[PDB]
Write a protein that binds this ligand. Sequence first.
Ligand SMILES: NC(=O)c1ccc[n+]([C@@H]2O[C@H](COP(=O)([O-])OP(=O)(O)OC[C@H]3O[C@@H](n4cnc5c(N)ncnc54)[C@H](O)[C@@H]3O)[C@@H](O)[C@H]2O)c1
Ligand SMILES: NC(=O)c1ccc[n+]([C@@H]2O[C@H](COP(=O)([O-])OP(=O)(O)OC[C@H]3O[C@@H](n4cnc5c(N)ncnc54)[C@H](O)[C@@H]3O)[C@@H](O)[C@H]2O)c1
Ligand SMILES: NC(=O)c1ccc[n+]([C@@H]2O[C@H](COP(=O)([O-])OP(=O)(O)OC[C@H]3O[C@@H](n4cnc5c(N)ncnc54)[C@H](O)[C@@H]3O)[C@@H](O)[C@H]2O)c1
Ligand SMILES: NC(=O)c1ccc[n+]([C@@H]2O[C@H](COP(=O)([O-])OP(=O)(O)OC[C@H]3O[C@@H](n4cnc5c(N)ncnc54)[C@H](O)[C@@H]3O)[C@@H](O)[C@H]2O)c1
Ligand SMILES: [Zn+2]
Ligand SMILES: [Zn+2]
Ligand SMILES: [Zn+2]
Ligand SMILES: [Zn+2]
Ligand SMILES: [Zn+2]
Ligand SMILES: [Zn+2]
Ligand SMILES: [Zn+2]
Ligand SMILES: [Zn+2]
Lengths: 346, 346, 346, 345
Amino acid sequence: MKAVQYTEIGSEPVVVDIPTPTPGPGEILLKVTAAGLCHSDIHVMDMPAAQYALGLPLTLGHEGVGTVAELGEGVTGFGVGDAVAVYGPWGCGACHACARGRENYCTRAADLGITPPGLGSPGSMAEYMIVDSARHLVPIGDLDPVAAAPLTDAGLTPYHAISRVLPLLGPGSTAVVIGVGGLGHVGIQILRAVSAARVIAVDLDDDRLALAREVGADAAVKSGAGAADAIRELTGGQGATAVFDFVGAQSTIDTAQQVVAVDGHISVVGIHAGAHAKVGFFMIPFGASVVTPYWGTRSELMEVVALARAGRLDIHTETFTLDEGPAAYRRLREGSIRGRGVVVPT
Amino acid sequence: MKAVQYTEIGSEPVVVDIPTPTPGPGEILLKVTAAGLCHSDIHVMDMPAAQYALGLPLTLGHEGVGTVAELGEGVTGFGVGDAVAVYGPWGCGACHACARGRENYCTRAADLGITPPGLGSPGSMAEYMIVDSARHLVPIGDLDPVAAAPLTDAGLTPYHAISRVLPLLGPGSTAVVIGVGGLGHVGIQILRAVSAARVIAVDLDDDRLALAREVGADAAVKSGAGAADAIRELTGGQGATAVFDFVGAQSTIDTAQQVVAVDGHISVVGIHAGAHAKVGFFMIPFGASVVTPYWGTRSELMEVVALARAGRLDIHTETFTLDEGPAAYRRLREGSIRGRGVVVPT
Amino acid sequence: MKAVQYTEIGSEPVVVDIPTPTPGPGEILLKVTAAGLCHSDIHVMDMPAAQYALGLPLTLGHEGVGTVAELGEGVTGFGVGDAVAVYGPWGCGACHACARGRENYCTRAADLGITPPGLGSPGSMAEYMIVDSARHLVPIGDLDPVAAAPLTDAGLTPYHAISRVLPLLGPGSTAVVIGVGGLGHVGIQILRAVSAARVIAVDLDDDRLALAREVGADAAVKSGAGAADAIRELTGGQGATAVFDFVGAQSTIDTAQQVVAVDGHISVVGIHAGAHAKVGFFMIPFGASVVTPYWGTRSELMEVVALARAGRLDIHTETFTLDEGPAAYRRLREGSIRGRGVVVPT
Amino acid sequence: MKAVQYTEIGSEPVVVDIPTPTPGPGEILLKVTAAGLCHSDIHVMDMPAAQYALGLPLTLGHEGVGTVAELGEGVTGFGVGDAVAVYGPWGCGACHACARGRENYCTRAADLGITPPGLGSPGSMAEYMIVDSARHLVPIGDLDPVAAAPLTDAGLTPYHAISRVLPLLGPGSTAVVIGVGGLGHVGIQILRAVSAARVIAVDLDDDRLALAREVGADAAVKSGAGAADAIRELTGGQGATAVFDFVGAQSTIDTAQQVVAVDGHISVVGIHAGAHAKVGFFMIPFGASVVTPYWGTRSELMEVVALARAGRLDIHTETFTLDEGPAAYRRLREGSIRGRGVVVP
Ligand SMILES: NC(=O)c1ccc[n+]([C@@H]2O[C@H](COP(=O)([O-])OP(=O)(O)OC[C@H]3O[C@@H](n4cnc5c(N)ncnc54)[C@H](O)[C@@H]3O)[C@@H](O)[C@H]2O)c1
Ligand SMILES: NC(=O)c1ccc[n+]([C@@H]2O[C@H](COP(=O)([O-])OP(=O)(O)OC[C@H]3O[C@@H](n4cnc5c(N)ncnc54)[C@H](O)[C@@H]3O)[C@@H](O)[C@H]2O)c1
Ligand SMILES: NC(=O)c1ccc[n+]([C@@H]2O[C@H](COP(=O)([O-])OP(=O)(O)OC[C@H]3O[C@@H](n4cnc5c(N)ncnc54)[C@H](O)[C@@H]3O)[C@@H](O)[C@H]2O)c1
Ligand SMILES: NC(=O)c1ccc[n+]([C@@H]2O[C@H](COP(=O)([O-])OP(=O)(O)OC[C@H]3O[C@@H](n4cnc5c(N)ncnc54)[C@H](O)[C@@H]3O)[C@@H](O)[C@H]2O)c1
Ligand SMILES: [Zn+2]
Ligand SMILES: [Zn+2]
Ligand SMILES: [Zn+2]
Ligand SMILES: [Zn+2]
Ligand SMILES: [Zn+2]
Ligand SMILES: [Zn+2]
Ligand SMILES: [Zn+2]
Ligand SMILES: [Zn+2]
């Protein structure tokens, strides 16, 4: 089969020919229908040799949808042809977190060497993929696979981050979204669907501000040194109830701390190595909690799919072939994909 | 009347003779029965002139209990002689936070010049004190005033910090308490009363570790460079579900980040200027939230009093006269009060 | 001043001429700008002499908005001319429930003889009204008073009922609204604003089903014997996550029990004397909780006003003069007010 | 192997000799170390033929602990010899409820024919038992199996019921426990461990009131017509924040409605056919919610085990052999087991 793999440290990913896998006991083979590109793939490929621990080669793609092609021995609850999304942050299935479906917060996965597809195990950017267990498949019914693939991370991750503090986001609340890319453009729409928060979007790029308004942001303002004052003008001095920072640069985290309300929240979702919130007296308002959330839970993925099926999420995508996978990664690096890049195999 | 006041920047507080106040409309005059000393009073008195904004003179004491002495015009929900605790973090009473009793998170108090007794308004370290409004009094019935005074901050503040994340602290959870002083020795007991968390106490001083065990800590660990490893030995690699840091020095916050569990919590309650948690990827576990809480809510103070009335809080105190107030502050500075210092007027 | 009063048991309310009140200490005099009619006023007026305990005469109107006309002695936080909504379910202000703003669940109000305006104290269906305390006023700014008056009960009560179980109403959930009248037509819109629930409305009247669709219901079902099966056809066998019954007749409660999901909720909001849910094994699904909520909380009223100010609530009203008040009650009895009746004084 | 089975409608269960099962793919074979008797087994055996749908014969025992004896093909995460408790209310594993571990509220189990061990599938009252999937085993380490077996239902069910409303049970709250038997005596201890609620126990039997005080109830009062007034004397007119009714007779539900506080809770846990709370205006306080909870969740079972391992649960048991199983059921029917009956193979 054709796949896109990271094969050597510091190089671009390459299109390869590797064996179509066969599912072992408990596993499911999917024919992949769509595979999302995530900025996290750039972080992974930019790691120096000393830091990179995901193994080479690595089939990329941790945003996967497909149809069930073959059932491994003992697998029940799915039939051949069923359309499914892949739950990404595989856990042990047995710990207290995993028992609640919160496999993103599994305490045993690292020690057991359990890694996500595309991030240590073979990913979705290939004609076929293996999923370890039936509990890591969620049915999508007739959802368009191209718009469905991003739900698995671009949807799930902001959904989880918002869910952690949803009770704060009542009528009269304000939620700031920093970074209107793959994650952020979905984050805006989640906020509109599951809360009555006023949504203020922030981006460096005026076209992304336009995207923010297109997907339902109440206001969209330019990132950088003037953003905190501009946000405060809109919120009137109380500041923002919650800030969801999908950039996570020191500058955006600083903006977040300068606008967050008393008893509010900052969710540092975007990854920029070394950047951090400074949570201390006189550096942040009283009661304003800060967290770096990770991916999301099993039940959250089902809820994201339910939002998509109800017409609440307009996922902006651009489609690529497998052969164009490396080109698509170049596009993502330069910031020229308006929403999510999605590879559609054959 | 006799009072203890901060009267000049950089000097020790002094015993003064000032007029006994009379309550205006809506106000209540209390005969003070006990006034707690808090380490925050040291922070206040150590502020340079440029930072200090609480006015001079200032009658100290933001931990107050008393009996109703005189009712201001229109006050009817209390009778003369009623034993009451003073709710400290006065708010506007009208905003969304205040409507929920969360006057600690009032968004209008600063603009309206509303300050706590002992922290901008006249405090409890005096024979009598004024309370602005009936809603800032909570009945204590026949509770011993000496042990009751600390409930208003040494109890309330840890109670609020714990309450923010109480759902995390189920059976099998671990809570670390750093600093077994006024607040910390009460924090341990709150954890034991309202949760099934295993409690690990951390202090520099062996006698404070003894105090921790006396009030129900399951284990005691010496603070400093070995603490993180010692805590991990006790928690077995998962780390601590929650860390309540009543010291808030950079070293204790660092210990907290090194032991907190995935999807756990660090509550930075202690104040050490400049110190902060560094909340960013690779510097803290996924999902581990961090906050600097402030004081507590009206209903929380009622709950703290209910714990005390049910025999769940053994408050360790040493009693001082008003004349000994300055000496008691020297004792607190040197770390020689085993629990809470409490002034009992005349 | 002109007012509408219930003056004798079993008779229609009458237009009267009574003295314009003067505010005592702590009280506020409002010039009333709008006064809502509620079906609860019909229940009150239909009580026989033996049951009726609200006093005669009674100025009706427990849905009140106005402008501050006079401040009683000692009142702060409002100026003459301020536009305000009246928080209805007055409590003692001091108990644990009231400290959280939950004066609807005050444990002391009955013993202290604290009754709501229009329901034991003089109501809003008059040129002027007294409010007991500043904490019972919520600013509305420039909101149209006619559409604002219903927020105080037609908005607040469904808002509270929904808020009790909001975490259940995630994407993929279904909420049934039974009774598309004053409360129900607002309930539908609240559900759409604060949740991603699919909303199914139920009414006896096809024109009310049309109203339900106009205000955002996803589906509309005729009430009566076929309703339960019709709702199950829409929900596909799982049943409805929550049922908000604004009728509360035995037949509607029975429908609710027959459609509610496992681990779901029935909120019996409508009042029909003698009607009750039967909560026992084999009579209701496992985990499906049932409650009769009452009115709402202070912070909830603020949230309702915030929804209105954000354009999320289209309140359907018909306006009446004070002289037409009795006629408007006849209209409400016959079911001919499409939404909420609102009296606008002079 | 020896087992205790319900074999004909209306008869007492019998001790039988049946084949030791072998685990299929994904399944685990346990050597049973303890099997709890539950009053629900009496309800099941008292069903007439028309209502009984669990199949005959049925190996009883839905409270099971054991050691892993054999792993079925493909099973990982457990080794032979591991001490485990059996999670009872098996669900589909895939629906929204099951994804949260809330298999007790699974919406698909009935349609898929998934039934609990001892309640449609073969139970724990036997030398060996099959468990369908690894996710239905919870490690217990060195916990005494006799005291551990009741954790799976006598512990789990009250734990779930309490957990549904735990945020209500702050300092100053009162929780009433009606029925100090298998479930109720554990419910009291759960309340003491995870809340600061004052606990008032209610029972018909003075010896059970003594049990309640022994396991930490703050007061223990006689059930019946005077109970509501006696409870109100203790709570001072506000009533009880929550009432956990482990009897569920109409009389106890009525007591519950007569004492519950405004914005409180009644959890109808005990099963008495036809009995129900009457939740309507003028019949219950404003805001007092009522529910019939069912069993508990996967993560709750882990939490119950954690309470037991921390020494927070003193489970009162009486031990029986397999041969004594039928005799033990007679004891349970007459109300003469002080706590939980447990069969040890
Ligand atoms: N915490 C997690 O679990 C998790 C999961 C998925 C992705 N991520 C991270 O989230 C981030 C976003 O991922 P993505 O795929 O949406 O990225 P993307 O490349 O699709 O989008 C980036 C967007 O951010 C904007 N941007 C960049 N710098 C900015 C600044 N200083 N201010 C405002 N806007 C700015 C860009 O203009 C663009 O719109 C990445 O760091 C990624 O690794 C984290
Ligand atoms: N967040 C709030 O709203 C709030 C309210 C009250 C107090 N505070 C702050 O909480 C802190 C504690 O106040 P207190 O009155 O309980 O103080 P205290 O002087 O009574 O107690 C200090 C304790 O911390 C211990 N300690 C000091 N350094 C330590 C270290 N490096 N590691 C471990 N233990 C250490 C001491 O040995 C002592 O037991 C102060 O900074 C105070 O200002 C905050
Ligand atoms: N719980 C509380 O705190 C609280 C507060 C306010 C009102 N209420 C009660 O809520 C109820 C609704 O009040 P309202 O002012 O909105 O009433 P309303 O007269 O404006 O509306 C009644 C609506 O219910 C519909 N209806 C009547 N019988 C029905 C049935 N069997 N099935 C379906 N629909 C039916 C009518 O067609 C109409 O659309 C009343 O009983 C009132 O007393 C309760
Ligand atoms: N909801 C669920 O998922 C679930 C799970 C397990 C058990 N149950 C049910 O819980 C109930 C309790 O089971 P158990 O095994 O603990 O029973 P048991 O036979 O061990 O205990 C019964 C106790 O209730 C007392 N009692 C009986 N009638 C009473 C009354 N009127 N007032 C006060 N006390 C009274 C007895 O004196 C005894 O102490 C049963 O109906 C059982 O079927 C329900
Ligand atoms: Zn990603
Ligand atoms: Zn795990
Ligand atoms: Zn203090
Ligand atoms: Zn305020
Ligand atoms: Zn009404
Ligand atoms: Zn009250
Ligand atoms: Zn049972
Ligand atoms: Zn299921």
